[PDB]
Amino acid sequence: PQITLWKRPLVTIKIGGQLKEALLDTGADDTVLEEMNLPGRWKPKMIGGIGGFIKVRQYDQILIEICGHKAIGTVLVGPTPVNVIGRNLLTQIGCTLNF
Amino acid sequence: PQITLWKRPLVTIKIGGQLKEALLDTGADDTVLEEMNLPGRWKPKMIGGIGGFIKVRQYDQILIEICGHKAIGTVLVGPTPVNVIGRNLLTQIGCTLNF
Ligand SMILES: COc1ccc(S(=O)(=O)N(CC(C)C)C[C@@H](O)[C@H](Cc2ccccc2)NC(=O)O[C@H]2CO[C@H]3OCC[C@H]32)cc1
Protein backbone atom coordinates (compact mmCIF):
# COMPACT_ATOMS: atom_id res chain seq x y z
CA PRO A 1 0.00 0.00 0.00
CA GLN A 2 0.73 3.74 -0.06
CA ILE A 3 0.65 5.12 3.49
CA THR A 4 0.24 8.82 4.19
CA LEU A 5 1.64 10.28 7.40
CA TRP A 6 -1.11 12.42 8.95
CA LYS A 7 -1.50 9.51 11.38
CA ARG A 8 1.12 7.25 12.90
CA PRO A 9 1.96 4.44 10.37
CA LEU A 10 0.78 1.69 12.72
CA VAL A 11 0.31 -1.78 11.27
CA THR A 12 -0.48 -5.27 12.45
CA ILE A 13 2.46 -7.67 12.73
CA LYS A 14 2.69 -11.37 13.54
CA ILE A 15 5.66 -12.67 15.53
CA GLY A 16 5.99 -15.82 17.58
CA GLY A 17 2.56 -16.66 16.20
CA GLN A 18 1.07 -13.67 18.04
CA LEU A 19 -0.51 -10.54 16.61
CA LYS A 20 0.71 -7.11 17.69
CA GLU A 21 0.62 -3.49 16.55
CA ALA A 22 3.86 -1.83 15.48
CA LEU A 23 5.12 1.45 14.05
CA LEU A 24 6.77 1.63 10.64
CA ASP A 25 9.83 3.65 11.64
CA THR A 26 12.25 4.83 8.96
CA GLY A 27 14.36 6.56 11.61
CA ALA A 28 15.11 3.24 13.30
CA ASP A 29 18.03 1.15 12.05
CA ASP A 30 16.74 -1.83 14.03
CA THR A 31 13.44 -3.40 15.01
CA VAL A 32 12.67 -3.09 18.73
CA LEU A 33 9.64 -4.73 20.34
CA GLU A 34 8.20 -4.42 23.84
CA GLU A 35 8.93 -7.13 26.39
CA MET A 36 7.52 -10.45 25.20
CA ASN A 37 8.25 -14.16 25.25
CA LEU A 38 9.91 -15.44 22.05
CA PRO A 39 11.22 -18.97 21.43
CA GLY A 40 14.87 -19.77 20.85
CA ARG A 41 18.21 -18.33 21.83
CA TRP A 42 19.10 -14.67 22.25
CA LYS A 43 22.06 -12.55 23.26
CA PRO A 44 22.10 -9.41 25.43
CA LYS A 45 22.85 -6.19 23.56
CA MET A 46 22.60 -2.44 24.11
CA ILE A 47 20.84 0.04 21.84
CA GLY A 48 20.63 3.83 21.95
CA GLY A 49 17.71 6.09 21.15
CA ILE A 50 16.88 9.76 21.67
CA GLY A 51 16.93 9.49 25.46
CA GLY A 52 19.82 7.14 26.12
CA PHE A 53 20.68 3.46 26.01
CA ILE A 54 18.67 0.39 27.02
CA LYS A 55 19.41 -3.29 27.49
CA VAL A 56 17.71 -5.57 24.95
CA ARG A 57 17.60 -9.26 24.09
CA GLN A 58 18.71 -9.80 20.49
CA TYR A 59 16.91 -12.56 18.59
CA ASP A 60 18.46 -13.50 15.25
CA GLN A 61 16.66 -14.82 12.17
CA ILE A 62 13.11 -14.42 13.50
CA LEU A 63 10.09 -14.87 11.25
CA ILE A 64 7.87 -11.78 11.33
CA GLU A 65 4.97 -10.81 9.06
CA ILE A 66 4.35 -7.09 8.61
CA CYS A 67 1.05 -5.94 7.11
CA GLY A 68 0.89 -9.15 5.09
CA HIS A 69 4.55 -9.19 3.98
CA LYS A 70 6.98 -11.75 5.36
CA ALA A 71 10.41 -10.90 6.73
CA ILE A 72 13.07 -12.91 8.57
CA GLY A 73 15.61 -10.94 10.56
CA THR A 74 16.90 -9.53 13.80
CA VAL A 75 14.39 -8.46 16.45
CA LEU A 76 15.41 -6.65 19.64
CA VAL A 77 13.17 -7.06 22.69
CA GLY A 78 13.27 -4.71 25.65
CA PRO A 79 11.81 -1.62 27.31
CA THR A 80 11.06 0.42 24.21
CA PRO A 81 8.07 2.79 24.56
CA VAL A 82 6.59 1.51 21.27
CA ASN A 83 6.92 -1.52 19.00
CA VAL A 84 9.02 -0.17 16.12
CA ILE A 85 9.75 -1.83 12.77
CA GLY A 86 13.14 -0.56 11.62
CA ARG A 87 14.98 -0.47 8.33
CA ASN A 88 16.43 -3.98 8.76
CA LEU A 89 12.91 -5.31 8.11
CA LEU A 90 11.41 -2.43 6.12
CA THR A 91 13.92 -3.19 3.37
CA GLN A 92 12.82 -6.84 3.32
CA ILE A 93 9.19 -5.91 2.63
CA GLY A 94 10.21 -3.53 -0.13
CA CYS A 95 9.33 -0.31 1.67
CA THR A 96 10.44 3.03 0.22
CA LEU A 97 9.88 6.69 1.01
CA ASN A 98 8.42 8.76 -1.83
CA PHE A 99 7.65 12.45 -2.33
CA PRO B 1 12.16 11.15 -5.51
CA GLN B 2 12.07 7.58 -4.22
CA ILE B 3 14.33 6.80 -1.26
CA THR B 4 15.24 3.21 -0.46
CA LEU B 5 16.00 2.20 3.12
CA TRP B 6 19.24 0.24 2.80
CA LYS B 7 20.91 3.22 4.49
CA ARG B 8 19.61 5.97 6.75
CA PRO B 9 17.25 8.30 4.77
CA LEU B 10 19.31 11.44 5.31
CA VAL B 11 18.49 14.50 3.20
CA THR B 12 19.69 18.10 3.20
CA ILE B 13 17.46 20.64 4.93
CA LYS B 14 17.64 24.42 5.28
CA ILE B 15 16.52 25.99 8.56
CA GLY B 16 17.46 29.20 10.33
CA GLY B 17 19.77 30.08 7.47
CA GLN B 18 21.78 26.87 7.92
CA LEU B 19 22.12 23.72 5.81
CA LYS B 20 22.01 20.46 7.76
CA GLU B 21 21.53 16.72 7.26
CA ALA B 22 18.37 15.20 8.68
CA LEU B 23 16.50 11.90 8.77
CA LEU B 24 13.14 11.50 7.06
CA ASP B 25 11.56 9.72 10.03
CA THR B 26 8.08 8.21 9.82
CA GLY B 27 8.41 7.12 13.45
CA ALA B 28 8.74 10.69 14.73
CA ASP B 29 5.51 12.55 15.50
CA ASP B 30 7.43 15.84 15.67
CA THR B 31 10.56 17.34 14.13
CA VAL B 32 13.56 17.39 16.47
CA LEU B 33 16.78 19.20 15.59
CA GLU B 34 20.23 19.24 17.17
CA GLU B 35 21.02 22.22 19.39
CA MET B 36 21.06 25.50 17.46
CA ASN B 37 20.45 29.09 18.52
CA LEU B 38 17.23 30.00 16.76
CA PRO B 39 15.71 33.45 17.39
CA GLY B 40 12.24 34.00 18.76
CA ARG B 41 9.99 32.73 21.50
CA TRP B 42 9.82 29.09 22.50
CA LYS B 43 8.26 26.91 25.15
CA PRO B 44 9.67 23.87 26.96
CA LYS B 45 8.67 20.35 26.01
CA MET B 46 9.68 16.81 26.94
CA ILE B 47 9.74 14.09 24.29
CA GLY B 48 10.40 10.41 24.91
CA GLY B 49 11.74 7.48 22.95
CA ILE B 50 14.16 4.62 23.41
CA GLY B 51 16.22 5.38 26.49
CA GLY B 52 13.81 7.91 28.01
CA PHE B 53 13.08 11.62 27.66
CA ILE B 54 14.99 14.72 26.62
CA LYS B 55 14.10 18.36 27.25
CA VAL B 56 13.65 20.43 24.10
CA ARG B 57 12.66 23.95 23.09
CA GLN B 58 9.53 24.16 20.97
CA TYR B 59 9.52 26.76 18.19
CA ASP B 60 6.36 27.32 16.15
CA GLN B 61 5.87 28.43 12.54
CA ILE B 62 9.50 27.78 11.61
CA LEU B 63 10.38 27.81 7.91
CA ILE B 64 12.22 24.69 6.74
CA GLU B 65 13.13 23.48 3.26
CA ILE B 66 13.50 19.71 2.92
CA CYS B 67 15.25 18.42 -0.20
CA GLY B 68 13.93 21.43 -2.10
CA HIS B 69 10.37 21.26 -0.71
CA LYS B 70 9.32 24.17 1.49
CA ALA B 71 7.50 23.59 4.77
CA ILE B 72 6.51 25.56 7.85
CA GLY B 73 5.66 24.19 11.26
CA THR B 74 6.75 23.27 14.74
CA VAL B 75 10.41 22.41 15.32
CA LEU B 76 11.83 21.08 18.59
CA VAL B 77 15.44 21.94 19.44
CA GLY B 78 17.54 20.07 21.96
CA PRO B 79 20.35 17.60 22.71
CA THR B 80 19.30 15.02 20.13
CA PRO B 81 22.11 13.02 18.46
CA VAL B 82 20.41 13.31 15.05
CA ASN B 83 18.28 15.78 13.12
CA VAL B 84 14.86 14.16 12.68
CA ILE B 85 12.19 15.30 10.23
CA GLY B 86 8.91 14.11 11.73
CA ARG B 87 5.42 13.57 10.39
CA ASN B 88 4.32 17.16 11.03
CA LEU B 89 6.59 18.23 8.16
CA LEU B 90 6.73 15.03 6.09
CA THR B 91 3.04 15.39 5.30
CA GLN B 92 3.73 18.92 4.10
CA ILE B 93 6.22 17.75 1.46
CA GLY B 94 3.95 14.94 0.25
CA CYS B 95 5.97 12.07 1.68
CA THR B 96 4.47 8.58 1.76
CA LEU B 97 5.57 5.09 2.69
CA ASN B 98 5.15 2.54 -0.08
CA PHE B 99 5.40 -1.24 -0.27
C1 LIG C 1 7.05 13.55 19.88
O1 LIG C 1 7.94 13.68 18.81
C2 LIG C 1 8.94 12.70 18.82
C3 LIG C 1 9.95 12.70 17.68
C4 LIG C 1 11.04 11.65 17.66
C5 LIG C 1 11.10 10.64 18.81
S1 LIG C 1 12.38 9.39 18.78
O2 LIG C 1 13.59 9.96 18.17
O3 LIG C 1 12.72 8.96 20.14
N1 LIG C 1 11.70 8.15 17.84
C6 LIG C 1 10.43 7.64 18.34
C7 LIG C 1 10.32 6.14 18.16
C8 LIG C 1 11.29 5.40 19.07
C9 LIG C 1 8.88 5.75 18.51
C10 LIG C 1 11.89 8.27 16.41
C11 LIG C 1 12.76 7.10 15.96
O4 LIG C 1 12.81 7.05 14.57
C12 LIG C 1 14.17 7.29 16.49
C13 LIG C 1 14.93 8.39 15.77
C14 LIG C 1 16.38 8.38 16.28
C15 LIG C 1 16.70 8.86 17.70
C16 LIG C 1 18.14 8.86 18.21
C17 LIG C 1 19.27 8.36 17.31
C18 LIG C 1 18.96 7.87 15.90
C19 LIG C 1 17.52 7.88 15.38
N2 LIG C 1 14.88 6.06 16.20
C20 LIG C 1 15.33 5.10 17.18
O5 LIG C 1 15.25 5.26 18.35
O6 LIG C 1 15.88 3.93 16.62
C21 LIG C 1 16.54 2.94 17.52
C22 LIG C 1 16.21 1.82 17.16
O7 LIG C 1 17.16 1.52 16.01
C23 LIG C 1 18.41 2.32 16.32
O8 LIG C 1 18.75 3.25 15.00
C24 LIG C 1 18.55 4.48 15.33
C25 LIG C 1 18.63 4.48 16.84
C26 LIG C 1 18.15 3.05 17.29
C27 LIG C 1 10.10 10.62 19.96
C28 LIG C 1 9.01 11.68 19.96
Side-chain angles (χ1 to χ4, degrees), chain A residues 23 25 27-30 48-50, chain B residues 8 25 27-30 32 48-50 81-82:
Chain A
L23 181 73
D25 186 354
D29 301 343
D30 311 309
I50 202 169
Chain B
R8 294 192 180 208
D25 188 356
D29 295 339
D30 302 342
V32 194
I50 288 172
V82 183

Side-chain angles (χ1 to χ4, degrees), chain B residues 50-98:
Chain B
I50 288 172
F53 286 78
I54 59 165
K55 185 155 128 203
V56 298
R57 304 195 305 283
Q58 171 179 334
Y59 296 83
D60 298 330
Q61 294 304 103
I62 298 302
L63 307 162
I64 183 159
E65 188 174 87
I66 307 164
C67 203
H69 293 62
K70 295 190 178 58
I72 176 170
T74 298
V75 172
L76 313 177
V77 179
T80 177
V82 183
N83 296 313
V84 155
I85 302 305
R87 290 189 297 103
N88 69 307
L89 301 180
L90 294 174
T91 59
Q92 295 190 25
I93 64 177
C95 187
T96 54
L97 277 171
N98 301 82

Side-chain angles (χ1 to χ4, degrees), chain A residues 3 8 24 26 29 97-98, chain B residues 3 8 24 26 29 97-98:
Chain A
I3 297 172
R8 291 186 169 129
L24 300 183
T26 57
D29 301 343
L97 289 162
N98 302 260
Chain B
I3 297 173
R8 294 192 180 208
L24 303 180
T26 62
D29 295 339
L97 277 171
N98 301 82

